[PDB]
């Protein structure tokens, strides 16, 4: 557990401090995206992920990876490809992928 928790903490740290992480630091507000919570069925953001991680809710890598991936896929499904949010999501998603591959967390 201690090795996994250490790895996941470092990953989320690097992701949340990335220059393209800013759109994902807090949950999407209804007022800023009317209808978001109708069309995006499972919202996720990095504050929520930090709360879940700190609460020791991620006893497997799989939940953590799925939640973090969904931050980016939600963004890239909702927003226009030419939007800054979409572009940030694409960049940060690639960073995320590099971090999980670096840690040996991809399925063998």
Ligand X SMILES: CN1CCC[C@@H](Nc2cnn(C)c(=O)c2Cl)C1
Footprint on this chain of ligand X (rule: CB under 6 A) = 23-24, 26, 28-29, 32-33, 36, 75, 78-79, 85
Among residues 40 and 63, whose Cβ is nearest to ligand X? 40
The least CB distance from residue 74 to ligand X, in Å, is 7
Among residues 7 and 20, whose Cβ is nearest to ligand X? 20
The least CB distance from residue 28 to ligand X, in Å, is 4
DSSP 32: T
Among residues 5 and 43, whose Cβ is nearest to ligand X? 43
Task: Reduce the DSSP state of residue 33 to 3 states and report it.
Answer: coil
The least CB distance from residue 50 to ligand X, in Å, is 15
* H or E element at residue 4: helix 2-16
Residues 85 and 22: beta-carbon distance below 8 Å:
no
Task: Reduce the DSSP state of residue 30 to 3 states and report it.
Answer: coil
Cα 21–Cα 51–Cα 27 angle in degrees, nearest 5 = 50
């Amino acid at each position: 557990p201690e090795q996994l928790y250490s790895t996941l903490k470092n990953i989320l740290q690097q992701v949340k401090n990335h220059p393209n992480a800013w759109p994902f630091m807090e949950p999407v507000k209804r007022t800023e995206a009317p209808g978001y919570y109708e069309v995006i069925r499972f919202p996720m953001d990095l504050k929520t992920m930090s709360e879940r991680l700190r609460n020791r809710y991620y006893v497997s890598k799989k939940l953590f990876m799925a939640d973090l991936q969904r931050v980016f896929t939600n963004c890239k499904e909702y927003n226009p490809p030419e939007s800054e949010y979409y572009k940030c999501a694409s960049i940060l998603e690639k960073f995320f992928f590099s971090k999980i591959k670096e840690a040996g967390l991809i399925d063998k």
